Design an enzyme around this catalytic site. Sequence first.
Site, PDB file in Angstrom:
ATOM      1  N   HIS A 201       0.824  -1.120  -0.106  1.00  0.00           N
ATOM      2  CA  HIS A 201      -0.009  -0.076   0.166  1.00  0.00           C
ATOM      3  C   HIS A 201       0.936   1.054  -0.136  1.00  0.00           C
ATOM      4  CE1 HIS A 201       0.639   0.762   4.180  1.00  0.00           C
ATOM      5  NE2 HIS A 201       0.368  -0.202   4.705  1.00  0.00           N
TER       6      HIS A 201
ATOM      7  N   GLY B 265       3.460   5.830  10.343  1.00  0.00           N
ATOM      8  CA  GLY B 265       4.904   5.659   9.660  1.00  0.00           C
ATOM      9  C   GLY B 265       5.619   4.245  10.124  1.00  0.00           C
TER      10      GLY B 265
ATOM     11  N   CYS C  27       4.706   1.208   9.305  1.00  0.00           N
ATOM     12  CA  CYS C  27       4.292   0.261   8.515  1.00  0.00           C
ATOM     13  C   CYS C  27       5.782  -0.208   7.716  1.00  0.00           C
ATOM     14  CB  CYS C  27       3.364   0.767   7.420  1.00  0.00           C
ATOM     15  SG  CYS C  27       1.692   0.945   7.785  1.00  0.00           S
TER      16      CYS C  27
HETATM   17  C1  LIG Z   1       1.608   2.747   8.088  1.00  0.00           C
HETATM   18  O1  LIG Z   1       2.608   3.360   8.626  1.00  0.00           O
HETATM   19  C2  LIG Z   1       0.382   3.002   8.980  1.00  0.00           C
HETATM   20  C3  LIG Z   1       0.148   2.631  10.208  1.00  0.00           C
HETATM   21  C4  LIG Z   1      -0.968   2.900  10.954  1.00  0.00           C
HETATM   22  C5  LIG Z   1      -0.843   4.222  11.239  1.00  0.00           C
HETATM   23  C6  LIG Z   1      -1.742   4.541  12.839  1.00  0.00           C
HETATM   24  N1  LIG Z   1      -1.285   3.419  13.663  1.00  0.00           N
HETATM   25  C7  LIG Z   1      -0.826   2.292  12.467  1.00  0.00           C
HETATM   26  O2  LIG Z   1      -0.518   1.193  12.920  1.00  0.00           O
HETATM   27  N2  LIG Z   1      -0.754   2.470   7.962  1.00  0.00           N
HETATM   28  C8  LIG Z   1      -1.949   3.156   7.757  1.00  0.00           C
HETATM   29  O3  LIG Z   1      -2.083   4.069   8.087  1.00  0.00           O
HETATM   30  C9  LIG Z   1      -2.900   2.350   7.031  1.00  0.00           C
HETATM   31  C10 LIG Z   1      -2.876   2.594   5.602  1.00  0.00           C
HETATM   32  C11 LIG Z   1      -3.848   2.005   4.789  1.00  0.00           C
HETATM   33  C12 LIG Z   1      -3.683   2.379   3.108  1.00  0.00           C
HETATM   34  C13 LIG Z   1      -4.548   1.715   2.266  1.00  0.00           C
HETATM   35  C14 LIG Z   1      -4.785   0.156   2.521  1.00  0.00           C
HETATM   36  C15 LIG Z   1      -4.970  -0.030   4.116  1.00  0.00           C
HETATM   37  C16 LIG Z   1      -4.117   0.427   4.948  1.00  0.00           C
HETATM   38  N3  LIG Z   1      -4.205   2.718   7.605  1.00  0.00           N
HETATM   39  C17 LIG Z   1      -4.819   2.431   8.986  1.00  0.00           C
HETATM   40  O4  LIG Z   1      -3.921   1.737   9.826  1.00  0.00           O
HETATM   41  C18 LIG Z   1      -6.290   2.905   9.151  1.00  0.00           C
HETATM   42  C19 LIG Z   1      -6.809   2.656  10.309  1.00  0.00           C
HETATM   43  C20 LIG Z   1      -8.051   3.064  10.500  1.00  0.00           C
HETATM   44  C21 LIG Z   1      -9.251   2.941  11.681  1.00  0.00           C
HETATM   45  C22 LIG Z   1     -10.533   3.789  11.255  1.00  0.00           C
HETATM   46  C23 LIG Z   1     -10.271   4.663  10.275  1.00  0.00           C
HETATM   47  C24 LIG Z   1      -9.321   4.870   9.088  1.00  0.00           C
HETATM   48  C25 LIG Z   1      -8.076   3.907   9.404  1.00  0.00           C
HETATM   49  N4  LIG Z   1      -7.092   3.806   8.676  1.00  0.00           N
END
Ligand SMILES: *C(=O)[C@H](C[C@@H]1CCNC1=O)NC(=O)[C@H](CC1CCCCC1)NC(=O)c1cc2ccccc2[nH]1
Lengths: 302, 299
Positions: B39, B141, B143
């Site tokens: 992603h 960040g 991920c």
């Molecule tokens: C990567 O670094 C982050 C790690 C998250 C951020 C906050 N705490 C974590 O572990 N990953 C994300 O932000 C994902 C990205 C998405 C991109 C498209 C495909 C799916 C993943 N998003 C989320 O983790 C996330 C959780 C959440 C809960 C409620 C509403 C929106 C939402 N987005």
Amino acid sequence: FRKMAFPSGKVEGCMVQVTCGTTTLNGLWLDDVVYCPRHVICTSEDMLNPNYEDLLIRKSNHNFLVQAGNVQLRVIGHSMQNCVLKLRVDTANPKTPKYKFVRIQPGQTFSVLACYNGSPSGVYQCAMRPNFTIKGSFLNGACGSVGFNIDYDCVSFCYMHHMELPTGVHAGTDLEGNFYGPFVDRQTAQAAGTDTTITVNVLAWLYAAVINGDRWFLNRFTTTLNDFNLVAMKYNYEPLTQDHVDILGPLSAQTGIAVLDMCASLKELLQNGMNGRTILGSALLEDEFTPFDVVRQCSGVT
Amino acid sequence: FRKMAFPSGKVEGCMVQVTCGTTTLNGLWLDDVVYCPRHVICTSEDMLNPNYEDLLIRKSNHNFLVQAGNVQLRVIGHSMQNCVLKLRVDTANPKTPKYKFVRIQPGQTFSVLACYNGSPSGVYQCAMRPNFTIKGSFLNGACGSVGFNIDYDCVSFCYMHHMELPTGVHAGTDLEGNFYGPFVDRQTAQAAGTDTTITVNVLAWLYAAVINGDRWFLNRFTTTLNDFNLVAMKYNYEPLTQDHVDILGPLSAQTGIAVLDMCASLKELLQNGMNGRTILGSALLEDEFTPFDVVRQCS
Ligand SMILES: *C(=O)[C@H](C[C@@H]1CCNC1=O)NC(=O)[C@H](CC1CCCCC1)NC(=O)c1cc2ccccc2[nH]1
Ligand SMILES: *C(=O)[C@H](C[C@@H]1CCNC1=O)NC(=O)[C@H](CC1CCCCC1)NC(=O)c1cc2ccccc2[nH]1
């Protein structure tokens, strides 16, 4: 929210094995010096009342076998500084990080890299208790394992492991060989003082709880330092000083809960219990997170 | 007794930073391949129903900026394996440890090296919950951070981090890019299953408490396996299987307490609580130490 240790890689490359007679334990290899507990030169004969200066004169360079992995390090010199032995080796450690030796204060936290036979085996976060012990996890051979904090690229070494007290808690020195707490390196009847709880750290953890959405313990009330300390004393908590309140300044500003407002919550938690609830997934009031620890975990500082 | 993580040095030397568009996360650099969550190639308009095949075909090697410390790694090619992107680079990682990729089962524990911008920030112990989430500690960040165990000098990578669920627990893949659990890399409404307590681990922990000299929770009773499971499910404990009973055999032999006798203690602990006491420093029953973990830390 978890107990998070520092990444240990910079320290792993410093751990070596030291053998003197039938005793093996760990040493810290930095530049051309290996540091380890001076009790490595003790036999079971003189563990009870050692004369370390006499025992050290009787030893020669060859009585120390130092092994960095599979490579033998030749000992070219030996000396004592307080309760640590300094073995000069012919080779500077090419993996020596930027480092310093620091002495920490009770209530401060650090990471422990537990080692056996010179090999790192596990890492975990510890705090120096008010009674100068640490609640570690150490088996036979753990001596010479070190505690440390990392700041940018600089490793600050603060602890070297020496002994386990009858109650199962642990005692050691800073890296200049000065003991933490009223303990001596001889096999004798030793007991820690009655421990107390680290008030400023408990507060910091309540702020961490609020930041993470756990808010049931907050209330409308505030208190005074004077009033809270009479409760702290009653519950075997360290007194709270103005310095503590100021260090919690940042967390008070981020959450809008003032320290003496949070003390009212803490006072009620002490006076009435937790009513079968939990805080950050704990049934006890956690006291091994400093204010800095809370910020760094809720700020992601690398 | 402590939640002990593995020393993280071998993993630290593998962490890099991967940037695509406005998104930066962490990558795992082993030999000449950088593994990261796919992603990374999503934009703000793509997060609900990304078509990853279509997003990836539009990318050139130079759209991926990979940095190992201050050194920029040149991307030589890219391919997708399930939900992980594999970036080929022109330089093999000279710090590549002995390693393997393993898929773990619920109840298994591992160390997490939390990283940001390719820099390791902390290390901690974690477990795969029965609902295939992990209760991690991750900020924006994080991920691409990985979970791992180390046996002798071999790093077994078992988790890569992708997302946070609405309840605050975390979901991710194995290093072949298959998600643990029913989760998908979409920002769609996804529901963690109802979680349960890892019974076999709680028992292992009770054996550890006996090894370190606490017997106060034992009693004169035994139980059948079926009767134990009927009681324990009422507290939202995972069923204990005969596999679990066999696994506990060594700890049973060392302490002299039959597995079903320890099950009887647990039933009573659930019924009574601890009555102001603690076990190995805890006021709750701990379920993130496995039978193997107990053995490693006690001997
Ligand atoms: C990567 O670094 C982050 C790690 C998250 C951020 C906050 N705490 C974590 O572990 N990953 C994300 O932000 C994902 C990205 C998405 C991109 C498209 C495909 C799916 C993943 N998003 C989320 O983790 C996330 C959780 C959440 C809960 C409620 C509403 C929106 C939402 N987005
Ligand atoms: C060094 O590797 C070990 C680490 C201990 C072992 C078990 N858990 C630990 O943390 N250190 C020791 O074994 C010391 C050695 C002594 C040598 C002479 C100077 C003092 C230290 N011994 C003990 O730690 C110790 C604890 C204890 C409790 C009850 C009776 C005897 C006893 N000895």
